[PDB]
Design a protein around this ligand. Structure first.
Ligand SMILES: NC(=O)C1=CN([C@@H]2O[C@H](COP(=O)(O)OP(=O)(O)OC[C@H]3O[C@@H](n4cnc5c(N)ncnc54)[C@H](O)[C@@H]3O)[C@@H](O)[C@H]2O)C=CC1
Ligand SMILES: Cc1cc2nc3c(=O)[nH]c(=O)nc-3n(C[C@H](O)[C@H](O)[C@H](O)COP(=O)(O)O)c2cc1C
Ligand code: SF4
Ligand code: FES
Ligand code: NA
Ligand code: NA
Lengths: 418, 155
């Protein structure tokens, strides 16, 4: 049928796995997916034990593509040691600044994600799975609903899937404008029909999640890897990129590059290679000043030779690459990041509630040259004191990128202090 | 206040979709805003009854979620991304073009109630910055002439 207009985001792959179909900017329906051997990994998986599937996902080295890089197999193992029923949740809330990797799988190859969800749900013994897609992805919502009906029609969903005795229904829930609803426990609160208020962890969802039952939350991109692990086997999957951080990775590249878009590359690729080898270098061939890893980290032009992996010295995060060049004002850029956290704090924790607001309020005064000496010292203090008592990652990192700009670009900040 | 049968039927479909009625709350509020061009305050008591939730619960959910608007009726919401990448690549050029065409700024509605400009955080299309939506449709802004053509399709 007819879906809402979507920008045609450029997509390029050196691996031809996650983007084998999604490199073409259109919906690939189930017939096209089946032509490429789609759903044969599910058939293979249903002839394996759930425990065997968990062992393969563990040995694959697959790590959470949502940005934290938690080992996926180990997350499943934690869930299955707890009594059922269990739930499987696909996190499609993707709302990190610069991050548009998940939507191109959802909108172009929805069956890759659906096949992943069914195999993952079987592995952990979940008969009820959810996709939580952000409100601002309406096309993705309609495309997934249509794709789930296609999967039902072909007998990949419903009761007794392909005579396996395994039952599954996938429910598509929509967000309504809260970045915090991507936080796995806020997501679960929203699925329960409440405000997106993160829960104190532990417990982790794998112990107590949806309706207090063992719940696995995995990112769209994580789940899209599962069909490849089963199809190829964990050994062949581990041949992709470095053996310690294996498999394809999606890199959403934006800002001052010639070819902004999503790049499917192995994680031994360097940040320099992402910008210059793949994304075509900088607009006007201007020097790189900084890379924002979404709203999480700020890397200087001295840090471009790092691997795009989940190692301690690696890029990590979502793989989001926002490129700023020599003429971009780092303080103006810092203000946009402060404004983001101001807008998205849920306000449960006092230092996060007041700190996100004051960080943005004071940095605006600084940017506009209206800051008193006390506003300057106030800004420094609040930036260092958003994290205390925080119960989710937002409070923990709301000052992180901005602190990195103060340390890495002091000359630029000093210009504003004068 | 009563929901028209065509809207009520859609709401009942959402409530019947999930295993628990209360899980449909966001899909119902999206449906209500789609129908009316905003969330009418009077709509919340009947919705609460249909979801078997207290009114104060439904009110708190409407307040929490930024896509829901209880203030201004608008046929078309122009969601303009004001986040880092769209800001770098020309959010201010898009806002200027919108002011030239429609005569309104962020937060304002055209005098005919047709267009509201809604400033939003990153829309997850950053490679295509600066980004805007017109209801469910999403576009890269290229120029005033291009924007004028796009807006002409919404009547
Ligand atoms: N994709 C997007 O648009 C966005 C991504 N993010 C990412 O979110 C990340 C932070 O996420 P968190 O969930 O706070 O990270 P985390 O490191 O606390 O947890 C990561 C995952 O591992 C699980 N886990 C961690 N420790 C565990 C344990 N002891 N037992 C069982 N399971 C355990 C958690 O339940 C979760 O599913 C950031 O690194 C950022 O990159 C943030 C916002 C938006
Ligand atoms: C404020 C906040 C927002 C988040 N938003 C998302 C999101 O949009 N998508 C996502 O998959 N993970 C998001 N996460 C991370 C999730 O809590 C969780 O770690 C992830 O969904 C687990 O899946 P993974 O192990 O496959 O990465 C967010 C975390 C925080 C603290
Ligand atoms: S740290 Fe911030 S966003 Fe997270 S629960 Fe506390 S107040 Fe809410
Ligand atoms: S910053 Fe505007 S779409 Fe991401
Ligand atoms: Na097709
Ligand atoms: Na897309």
């Amino acid at each position: 049928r007819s879906y809402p207009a979507i920008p045609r985001i450029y997509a390029e792959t050196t691996l031809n796995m996650l983007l084998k179909r999604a490199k073409k900017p259109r919906v690939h329906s189930i017939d096209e997916y089946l032509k490429d051997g789609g759903y044969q990994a599910l058939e293979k998986a249903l002839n394996m034990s759930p425990e065997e599937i968990i062992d393969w996902v563990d040995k694959s080295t697959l790590r959470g593509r949502g940005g934290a890089g938690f080992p996926t197999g180990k997350k499943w193992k934690f869930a299955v040691q707890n009594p059922g029923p269990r739930y499987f949740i696909c996190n499609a809330d993707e709302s990190e600044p610069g991050t548009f990797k998940d939507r191109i799988i959802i909108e172009r190859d929805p069956h890759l994600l659906i096949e992943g969800i069914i195999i993952s749900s079987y592995a952990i013994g979940a008969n009820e799975a959810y996709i939580y897609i952000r409100g601002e992805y309406p096309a993705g919502y309609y495309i997934l609903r249509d794709a789930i009906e296609e999967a039902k029609k072909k007998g990949f969903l419903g009761k007794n899937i392909l005579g396996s005795g395994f039952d599954l229904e996938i429910y598509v829930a929509r967000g309504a404008g809260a970045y915090i609803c991507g936080e796995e426990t806020a997501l679960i609160e929203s699925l329960e029909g409440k405000r997106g208020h993160p829960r104190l962890k532990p417990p982790y969802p794998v112990q107590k999640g949806l309706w207090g039952k063992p719940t696995v939350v995995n990112n769209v991109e994580t789940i899209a890897n599962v069909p490849f692990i089963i199809s190829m086997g964990w050994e062949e999957y581990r041949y992709i990129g470095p053996s310690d951080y294996a498999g394809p990775k999606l890199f959403p590249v934006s800002g001052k590059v010639k070819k902004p878009g999503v790049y499917e590359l192995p994680m031994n690729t360097t940040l320099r290679e992402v910008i210059f080898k793949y994304a075509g270098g900088t607009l006007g061939n201007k020097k790189v000043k900084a890379v924002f890893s979404g709203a999480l980290d700020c890397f200087s032009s001295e840090e471009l030779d790092i691997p795009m992996d989940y190692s301690p010295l690696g890029f990590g995060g979502t793989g989001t690459v926002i490129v700023l060049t020599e003429e971009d004002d780092i303080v103006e850029a810092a203000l946009k990041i402060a404004e983001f956290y101001e807008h998205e704090t849920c306000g449960q924790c006092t230092p996060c509630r007041v700190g996100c607001y004051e960080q943005a309020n004071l940095l605006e005064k600084i940017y506009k040259g209206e800051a008193t000496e006390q506003d300057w010292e106030g800004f420094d203090f609040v930036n260092r004191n958003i994290q205390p008592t925080s119960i989710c990652g937002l409070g923990a990192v709301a000052g992180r990128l901005i602190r990195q700009t103060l340390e890495k670009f002091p000359e630029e900040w000093e210009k504003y202090r004068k | 206040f009563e929901f028209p049968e065509e809207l009520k039927t859609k709401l009942q479909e959402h409530i019947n979709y999930f295993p628990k009625k209360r899980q449909a709350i966001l899909l119902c509020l999206h449906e209500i805003q789609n129908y009316y061009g905003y969330i009418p305050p009077e709509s919340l008591k009947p919705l609460a009854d249909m979801l078997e939730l207290p009114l104060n619960h439904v009110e708190g959910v409407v307040a929490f979620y930024d896509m829901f608007d209880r203030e201004d009726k608008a046929k078309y919401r122009i969601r303009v991304c004001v986040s880092i990448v769209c800001h770098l690549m020309g959010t201010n050029k898009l806002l200027k073009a919108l002011e030239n065409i429609l005569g309104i700024k962020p937060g304002e509605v055209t005098p005919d109630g047709k267009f509201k400009i809604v400033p939003v955080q990153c829309l997850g299309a950053c490679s295509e910055a600066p980004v805007f939506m017109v209801n469910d449709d999403e576009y890269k802004f290229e120029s005033e002439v291009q924007l004028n053509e796009i807006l002409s399709r919404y009547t």
